[PDB]
Structure 1
């Protein structure tokens, strides 16, 4: 899925605790916001523990 042309909003992304893994690669979750990217993609799959 391609997402573009909008205000990125990850406040609910890190303020929640239902997730199990939130370690980001290269970009840091603290500096994730206030960064202007050209395009952002999102893949999704179901895998085992």
Structure 2
């Protein structure tokens, strides 16, 4: 639902959502976007 939205809020008032009490499998993230910049800082995407 976060990546399926159509009206992403503006950067002046950036929409912020909380994700908890679930299982994070980033395959849906990988296949839900033609990534242009995946610059991770605190955690490597490999073991994510």
TM-score (norm 2): 0.51
**Higher share of residues assigned strand:** 1
Structure 1: give runs of 5+ residues left out of the alignment: 33-49
> Equivalents in 2 of 1:24, 1:3: separation in Å?
18
Bigger relative contact order (CA 8 A; separation at least 6): 1
Q: What is the deviation of 1:11?
A: 1.1
Structure 2: give runs of 5+ residues left out of the alignment: 1-16
TM-score (norm 1): 0.51
Runs of 4+ deviating beyond 4 Å: none
Provide the aligned C-alpha RMSD in A: 1.8
